[model samples]
Target chain A: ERAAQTRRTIVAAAAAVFDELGYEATTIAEILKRSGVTKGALYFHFTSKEQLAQEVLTSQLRAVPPVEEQRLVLQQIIDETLLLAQLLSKGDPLVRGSVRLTVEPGAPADGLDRRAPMQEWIGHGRDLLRRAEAGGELLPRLDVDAVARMLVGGFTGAQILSNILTGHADLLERVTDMHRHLMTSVAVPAVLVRLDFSAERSITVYDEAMR
Target chain B: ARQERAAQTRRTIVAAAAAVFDELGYEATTIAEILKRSGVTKGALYFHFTSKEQLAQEVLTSQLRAEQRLVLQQIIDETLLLAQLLSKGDPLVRGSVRLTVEPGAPADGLDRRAPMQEWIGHGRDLLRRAEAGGELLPRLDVDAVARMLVGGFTGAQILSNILTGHADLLERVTDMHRHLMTSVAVPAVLVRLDFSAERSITVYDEAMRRREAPLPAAGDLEH
Candidate 1:
């Protein structure tokens, strides 16, 4: 258990450093300084900086707890997306650093596949949309696959915009507005009227996930 | 003639920088690569822009200036035109995006939000007019919606660029417009909005043709 705790500490510290400095510019020394863990303990867990970054990149999605299953899969989808935006807005180092690692150019040529996490999110979105469609919560004319892809794409852009513009001070609001726009277009009127697009919703879902 | 030559040199340098930045990102790009691609002497390059950061700012400024005419068009048309520009994959647009949004980018005195805020402001202007014209829903928050549209489009463009080298950009933008219509437009106006990506291409092509069309003799400009 102590070893596990030490590893988490190292990862969290590395994530904060990576989030600020990006992949190529980040040094193991910086991680060591931030983590306050001795080199022996650090190496016992992470063999190299590349391995540490790979861990952070791959672990981004796992940082969020899965949404509780709900009868309304569309709501579940919204909750999951908002939960992510909420975490990202709060500057969760893991998510922020993972995003920076994935999107920033100049990673070593042979580093981890940067596209994998994005693809995973897109796939997850499609899965939720497919379930929503099957449950008749979605508009009959809505193309689930296309809409799902757009959701992922749109959220990404919104996050970047918020980050660059306000250091994510506006991420939750921007993401909530995005979902409001999307839900209005895709959800059937009945379901849309009943849906919640609120920062509080994200907070509630985030808290549940954390719990 | 001297002024014309100077302008030409500036354009060439900016274009070269745009291409380099787009491919390697801001940090990884070097002055040597830009100098090689532009075929401009070191002194000549430095004469126009003092640093790589200034060169990037020029490219971003040029991107906004290039679209001045688009902003003057109807709101929906302007969006389509903007989408077409993004999908067209002009090196400047792509490079400007990279410079603006890339994480850990050098400070460079660039306000990344300047262009986006300009776009959001333009969107709100049109949306306000749209509301007055009874095109928008009564209760819509025009500022929020406009910000959302710009933000969403920015995101979609970046993702498409990454996933497919922007081959899917037009389609994604079309989808975005359609989605925006549903949220902001009255049903009556929504059906009438031309959110088609193909139409955006046509509109863009027509606009380019008009801009390129020789100005009638100066005396005929008024007519």
Candidate 2:
């Protein structure tokens, strides 16, 4: 448990440093100083700085664990994705440090972004939509794939605006606008009825999402 | 006749240098290359400007002319004062986006910002309209209109990496138009779409004009 705790500490420290300095500007010495762990202890958990950065991204962006209960799925997916969007807006130092480590001139450029945990979050939404459709809760003509892509794209676009603005100043307003736009465009009448709330509650969801 | 020939030669050198710098970027281009492209001797080029940097500044100044005429004038003529002022991605403004991206070609130019001109021009266009309206468009709304257009232009350009070198600029610009139409336009044009092929030609001409003409301000004029 102590070893695991130390590993987590080191990982978090690296992420913090990366976030502040960006990838090219950060150094391993800074990570070591922040983590307060011996070189050997850090190496025990991860072989290199590149691997450490990748691990932090994985830990922070893990896919939402499946919940067999279908009713809870929409709220769970929204909650998980909103959390990830917040993190992405305030990118972890570890991810920041390795932001371009994969893009330097001669570096081994594999499909790293595709493997990111964010993709799984996107998949989770799609899976739920498929399940909802199967259960006849969704519109028969609804394109689950397109809706998933729209949600993911909208989240990313909103996160980018948040990152630019810093803090959540316009985040909820922008996200809610995007959400309403997508929901109105895609939500089936039956699905809409199920998800509908009073005008007051609808406003509350918009306000709460930003917080 | 000799002086006339010298002035024409200088313009030729500056134009050639601007094209190279715009396309190749600043650090990558050299003076010899400019001379080669213009088909002028080193002496002829020097007679026009002291160095490459000066030549670049001339190009930048000259480029704004076409924009002022083709794009800016149309805005002045057609839309009501406020509507004209707040117009962001209209045909005239979009044409001038290219200069901002790669402005290294000017010989002695400092602060190469062809892209910025697009922002400032749009801002100036709107400001002119608002001032002419005299509270017709409402006071202080002009500032909001100008700022929104500035922000929109900057934000849209930021998507260049994803939009350009991948998708057709026209299609992407259409998407951009839809987004901007919903967000920027008040009461939005429900029936009218602004992007006709003819308008695109006018915009292209303004873009070409901005490339050919000297700067709107005194900075680009030959003393």
Candidate 3:
């Protein structure tokens, strides 16, 4: 529906604005200017700046890369975070905005991050691990959700520290380190050997995803 | 010399600054509130800390300076100290954490890395001690694991801040240690390490039972 299209339009526009300026510093007029949506359209789609803040904070779902058929599902799982770091590396405003919104203060400050992309990423991670388990890729008796939560939390933490330390220049390497450490616990040895956690895989995998 | 009085006054000022900055954050806190809470005169505070930036830096480092000298137990005790502080909302660890990861500029030309580097250094040293004591797996990179632990702890704190608002921080960091050990800890050590969520109180109980050195009393500065 065009309504859905308009909604996406407003949300993405607001994400970039919030990315450049924090949740408090952003305004609807600036969103309108950037999105080129009229006041009626924006308010119709999004009620207020805080509503938009909530939207963008949970907006990283769309930022995840699409599935690849040729690659192993486990590789694709690792690719998920690398692709995310890739997006952050490329300055994808929505992902960065959502990250900042999740971690930074100045939101409503009342367990709002429960709706953060973290929970969604956990569920999505479990889905991937389920697929891997079906494919006989994962180690037996692995708690898929715990691994999912740990990976999600670990990558977020890794990238956060990476951002503070190196301005994300080394995010690719840090993410790779995380995958390397976690792979031994989650994947069967046969599958682990097949996993390529190269830091540059972010670019190659993204290019493949584009195809 | 008047060293004892100045030292007591200095300690009181930094502790007061830590509580205020941790509660109100850097931008909202004022020197007047800290002075009133610390019971130090304007001249005394200014004498010790030339600016709030200096006071904040001192508070952030104070978290590190409180550690005792030992191996694995020291690391456990230090982490447990933060967990207990974070649990009780004491602002000792919370104050330092807020300043270390605070986004944007420092209060003009500050070194944000100083405290964080100190944490990383602290982690590295203890991990090395663990390695020397045969607690870590062979072929593990102490530097890498140390950085991972340091970064992971901060990251855990960041998430716990939003998810449970410090309510589950102790549990989260405890889990963080568990997962980190899964990769690098020797099986013998891993099986015995204390990763319990509730037993954190034991370490707290022990540390409080016999502290390294007690702070001076309130009237110690009156002289």
Candidate 4:
């Protein structure tokens, strides 16, 4: 953890400069000076200045709390979607980016079905059970709502524990384990027997679906 | 310590991405495609790509995000004995371990908070049968406890893994489940369950025996 604090000290201080001058403009010297970290310590923690920029980019990305932002960004897009709906007929791409200069007077305004990112997950899981039950893939006498919430919560918990613990490196296995336990239960012995939690695909499959 | 290692992994992944971007001669390579090859997952990959502006900036920045057994026995193989495969040497396993523990690596697309819902659905299924077969008690919240099982095991192994490469994983696992089932299962049923460290070994041995049988071969005892 010694390196941990030192690394963050570098990342945080570097982030401040990157924020001030941006990727190409920022220098490692400013970061070392601001954080008071030695040149040896800084480079030992991060190799190239490019690495720090990316890390800063990464930290910024992870900081977005998706729930409210999903809607917030949606409303902004909604503003544009309507703006596009009315304006695309008249506006064109140039007009769209350039048109926001309504003299800089007014600001911005809203917006899955594969549709929204996390929003679709519940439906996807809900839909999974819907189909699972229809085919007798699911065990009988189940309450779909609690069952869905249970899963969403359970999924949330496993991911969180890893967030707190593993940084999720074992998530593929953890997800595999959760599914392993789940399949053993709900799958008709016939279904569970055929199921392959062992080494099936995860995001690659998502790549296809989301594609 | 954990957070910092995660930081390194983020860089490892992101740096590898730099190679891809340079190789591609730039643009149009999917971060998904980049990360997909890097062997990270959808859930894990997305956490790194948290902002589109940032995701795009970073990708503008080559870009980049397993297996199993078990039917739970195989799961035990990987957790208890499998990570050691890297010790024999293979960058995949070596690099893989680097990511898994703080043994070390970069974090480019490592999902740190990968698949929560995947497991949630799993608990859903597990509990469904849990209730169907009466492995669980009525009014026990299969959803809740099913989740607890995951978080518990995760918590257990993380500590154990750090302590001794999970030398006492089964021991800790046994302790956890015993505590967990006190609320989850009927006393009659719970008592019949085997959260024993020996059971972990039993399952591991069976799993390993089956693996090497075609090929033959696997922790701890009670407190």
Identify the candidate with maximal lDDT: 1
Which residue runs does candidate 3 get wrong by more than 4 Å? Answer: A1-9, A69-72, A107-117, A134-136, A139-141, B67-77, B105-110, B138-140, B197-199, B210-223
lDDT of 1 at A45: 94
| Best model number under TM-score | 3
- The residue-by-residue lDDT of candidate 1 on A1-211, one tens digit each, is 6678999989989989888888877899999999999999999998999899887885446677788988688889888888888778778888888888877765447466666666776777888888889899988888877898778777877787777777788888887788778888899899888887777777788887887
- State which candidate has the highest DockQ: 1
Candidate 3 on A1-211: residue-level lDDT in tens? Answer: 5677888878888889877776777889999999998899888777878778777876556666585753578888877778887888888877888877776666345434444556676688899888888999988987887677667667777787777677788787776786678776778898889888886766788887765
Q: Write the per-residue lDDT of candidate 3 for residues B1-223, one digit (tens) a residue.
A: 4788678667777777877877776767789898667666776776777788777878778877764332555666677668777677665566877766655443334555566666778889888888788777788777667767666677777767765677777777766666776777777776776666556787777656743332434543333
Indicate the residue-level lDDT of A50 in model 3.
Answer: 76
Docking level for model 3: acceptable
Better of 2 and 4 by TM-score: 2
What is the per-residue lDDT of model 4 for residues B59-102, given as tens digits with 9 covering 90 to 100? Answer: 32110122321223222333333323222232222322223222
Predicted candidate 4 versus true structure: per-residue lDDT over A38-92, tens digit per residue = 9999878888876665455432112222221111221221122222222212222
Q: Considering TM-score, which of the candidate structures 1 and 3 is the better prediction for this target?
A: 3
List the candidates' TM-scores in order.
0.83, 0.49, 0.86, 0.33
TM-score, candidate number 2:
0.49
Error of 4 at B149 (Å): 1.3
> Which order, best to worst by DockQ?
1, 3, 2, 4
By summed lDDT, the worst window of 10 consecutive residues in model 1 chain A runs over: A105-114
